[model samples]
Target chain A: PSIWSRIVNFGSGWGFWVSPSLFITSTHVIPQGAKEFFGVPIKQIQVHKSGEFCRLRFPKPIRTDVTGMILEEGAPEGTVVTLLIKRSTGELMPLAARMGTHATMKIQGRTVGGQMGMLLTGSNAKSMDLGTTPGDAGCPYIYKRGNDYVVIGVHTAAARGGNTVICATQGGEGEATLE
Target chain B: APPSIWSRIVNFGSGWGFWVSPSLFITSTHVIPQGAKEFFGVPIKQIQVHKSGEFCRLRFPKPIRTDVTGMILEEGAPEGTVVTLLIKRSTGELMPLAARMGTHATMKIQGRTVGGQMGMLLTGSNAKSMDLGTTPGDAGCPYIYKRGNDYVVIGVHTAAARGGNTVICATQG
Candidate 1:
């Protein structure tokens, strides 16, 4: 199947259609107040009352060729995961990297240290060469379990030196189902 | 009638508690605070704040619960142990939250960093401040581990940090 269709561009960050209409992104991607993603005016935006997750509602339920991916809780240390990003030339590229130690990332303007974050190492550490920028904040970190590709974390922040960081949003998956 | 061993551990500063022994119960010193003479509305006879001032021993009215089926105070929790932080909702509803026990380290409160006594760091699906729907009233809540038929009080949920982790002080012996 084509997983590329599920990958989307949201503002500077990347988000995907978790459900028909529900889009999952990081709260930091969308600053306080303000609306519109890339050029699509938001219908409704619900930042988690607490936590680091956010939900963006569109004017209409989005139709994607690929079904929403299942959310897996933890990405074991040393597990190799694939990152999907859409390049400026409208090309979808796959980057393979191994998961580093568990750490914290800056979310909602605070250093939220917890077990929900993983470090991206090896492969394409700095996504700049591929035309992906910090704007790719809401992209999903997909890992293969058995034969299926499942999302483990969201592309939330980048470390110093342009390394990528992933934040776990296991609880945020529930918000998608609420749709 | 025999004296009741267990009583509700209360904190005048904030939230709930549970009894560990006949004359004693466990609570966070931050919950009782310094110079607190009573808890909620019940008068405190005496309070012992640990070296870290994170944990405290409270001596309250005995013969409180005739059955006395309260949790025992466990020494501390090892990292990666699955624990539950029990809290009372704003509506006074009792809720139990599942959290992963992180590591043990000294924590800073107010201005100074408290040491000698170690505290447990917790992370979970809602591994940040305000994720648990907790409020100021939920301070000093007990973090317990279930063993056999009874629960053991392992730590006290003291405060939430900026890093989005819940800091807990281990229950002192």
Candidate 2:
């Protein structure tokens, strides 16, 4: 079996088991007042002050669940990629790496940027249309090599609407700063 | 299983190719830069080359295998996705590798021009680090594996970079 077991579902959102006892998710998706990550009690929650990235930790390794994913920066446009929706489910979302604003955005004269809300348009192979669902927040945008699936970014949301839906690549923005 | 490697691995008198479709096959352009009436002494013709990779295709007069199946190229994957890189060891027996993502770069070997981004192995086996080079005629050979009941030909042993540490290359899936 692959690391689909490495995905940690928190009911309303998705999180990635990146290391022993450590998982990551979008800050807003952290079901406030929570005390655990996949039945394992949460030892601490560290949210990136900038991006939608958040890292949760447990005191010790999950033992059997210790294996996890490695983080790579990202590939350029036109490169094929996979976006893990949930469970062992993944969509071959090709060419979504292009077309998006980074941690900074100016909405109706308002501005926000700080490794906080970079976005990528998500779509299915069937329609190539943006279809990132609401629950997709904090999931993984991964690239596979051999048998290892490396993490490129953590999905945040389908911000905006209609032909304009996009996912925040929070992990890509702040993964460099996180341990 | 790779045992199927034997039956599928082709012998293109000019180079090598693993039979994928009943009529379609896979190999590098360097193996057969120009077309001919036959390959490996088999009455085959019209080599179809990729627009720009180290890849090229050939066909048979009819479907070769209906009982077993495999793929020359998998659309679901971008390029450069491999499982086991088979290496030849104590078996006279042969083997082979990531395959790095695709990048259609040009390669000049033995005065033959072949290009494509299959993979690049560094260190002792890259640059000159070829896990092994066919060492005889055309170096491009079939690197195969099985996917369930299907046999998959994922890469072609293209060129090797020697000097710095022995780098490796292949036209990949």
Candidate 3:
């Protein structure tokens, strides 16, 4: 079968927000007109050809200043940075930024509230079938009334047929393209 | 005695930045930054000790959206991708974005600076001038005007191998 299908038919969940150039998985399990894309900052995640196997992740050190910075080394993959978010009870904002390989862009319609608190997921997008049980992952999916965290979506796989499937905030994917 | 993860390096005024509110809050199981796993597919264990947990609480699987950056990190991440924040003592406000993984040996230690050339690696165009501040106000503090009142802590005289600067003088005495 040749091999240029490139896939397209979105709908799935997980992959909240990444940093390297762009990323943002989830559409209710790949089915909103999926195509899949998330270049690199990590490994290869090419999709299409019936897409739906782009399990990615990032945070080896994308530069916080001195901890890991996306695993350092002359850093330069697909850079784009602009963040100053703080909420959980300390609120803050400074939008206009880009970074990810999984992708999360939803500016078509809108939901949640205000900035929509990034979409709300809590627990860093748990997996192990999305049961999530370990202090609840990272906890920071705001919108509780302008508390705005803005991540939008994440849970990272575990709904082959629906047990609790999430991943849709950006605008709940209509044409798709969010934050 | 079960306290003090050795956190004492404050200096606010240079651009305004410093926060202190610790009675007990330390957790180091990070080890996940390789470009954030190319955009959340699965494998974002931890990386928010900014300078000693200024205010964190992570867990993301889906629900991205929060201020668009820093700690919004995800929705409610769609079920349970938590990651809270709000522990500032200075600067613009939400100050504590330190990952700057420069060397390429993270998970505990590594080195390299000038915002380039391998260390513990952490890209995004080097996120925040190659982030490296957990104190001295959190945001790349290692000022070396040199000699007298220098302030130091290059990780206790350079531990991540010859890269640390040694700047932690809250008025050393």
Candidate 4:
């Protein structure tokens, strides 16, 4: 099934729908005093206390067509994953790359390091052409096994030199109250 | 008189260490005064550092107090989560020192493991902000978050952040 319908544009980042009614994006992308998105009212928001991920809950499924994507945490250190983005020309683009390291602060951010360190992925032509901009944050980094697509990480900050790309990781200990 | 379970909070020379269990106390290794061995005037019986990071365990020659426990959160805290920083007074007082919170939580940190065998750098998490000082003898204090009547220890004050702020804390996790 096509995954384009589940990829959404939010703020300056991306939001991938997990179900017809639920949207999972980076917590940093959430707007202050937000109540709704795409005309569907937000019932509740689960801000992952320790992760960059957040879930926007809707009353029923609205937003897109067919079904939505699935979230699978800790996709091993070598599996090839795709960064799904909707290009300006209206075509869904896919940039595939390999996972690099899971330990240490190899991928440091300009502002501060990621919440729980980072998930390292290679950035090269052999990996994929690097066209991801800052706006690409919160997009899904997914691994495909046969017909199933499993989201392992959220597209977060990456090395500017086309050397490393940082994605999502595990852990969201508790919830942060929505304000 | 036998010490109260609450009395597990002690003067760890420069700062403080508190009871997690009746026998075990949690504190930072960085705050140890040079060549000092006594913890709260009581000789330390044994000390064990975590293989994962700087959060270590301290035990002294003692008996049990109520057998209740304080907790090591073992997870990261969100920024701006308000907590309290405390130290102990030599006069057997539990000092309510500073009301603090993190400007930055779960920062990437590299600390040398203790066992002194491999002696490699182990990356860990720390809360660096609420820039506090040691002039008041809060160098090894535990900054804790309150839940109901119980407390969730955020971290033990280790060293100050070298670049921006002061009072870098080693998280329980």
Best by lDDT: 1
For every model shown, what is its TM-score relative to the native structure? 0.43, 0.39, 0.23, 0.41
Q: What would the per-residue lDDT of candidate 2 be over residues B74-116, giving only the tens digit for each residue? A: 5222444333333332223442321233444566767876555
Best by DockQ: 3
A best-first ranking of the candidates according to their TM-score comes to: 1, 4, 2, 3
Candidate with more favorable, higher DockQ: 2 or 4:
2
List where candidate 3 sits over 4 angstroms from the true fold: A1-85, A89-179, B1-9, B12-92, B98-100, B104-173
Ranking by lDDT: 1, 4, 2, 3
Off by over 4 Å in 4: A40-43, A89-91, A101-129, A170-179, B1-173
Pick out the ten consecutive residues of candidate 1 chain A with the lowest summed lDDT.
A114-123
Query: What DockQ was computed for model 3?
Result: 0.09
Candidate 1 per-residue C-alpha lDDT over B27-144 given as tens digits, one digit per residue, 9 for 90 to 100 = 6655555676665445655433343456666665644434566457765676665555565554533444444566666666677765322332221222232233245667667676
Please give, for residues A21-116, the per-residue lDDT of candidate 3 as tens digits.
233343234444324343232234433221122223343323222211121111111323222222332323211122222323232232211111
Per-structure clash totals for the candidates: 5, 24, 194, 0
Tens digits of per-residue lDDT for model 4 on A1-179?
24656777787677788777767776667676767676655454444533555666776667557576666664565665656645433334345455655433344354322322222222221112223556677777776565566776666666555445666554423224689
Q: Give the DockQ (C-alpha) for candidate 4.
A: 0.01
Q: Which stretches of candidate 2 lie over 4 Å from their true place?
A: A1-14, A27-36, A41-52, A63-153, A158-179, B1-22, B29-56, B64-105, B110-112, B116-173
Mark the regions of model 1 whose C-alpha exceeds 4 Å error after superposition: A1-179, B1-11, B33-52, B115-126, B133-135
Whole-structure CA lDDT of model 3: 0.24
Better structure of 2 and 4 per lDDT? 4
Q: What is candidate 4's lDDT per residue for B1-173, written digit by digit as tens?
A: 01332355566656666676666677766656767666556654444435235455565456443465645554424554434445454554333322234443333446443221010001011112111123345555666555554566665665544422235566554
Pairs that collide, model 4: none
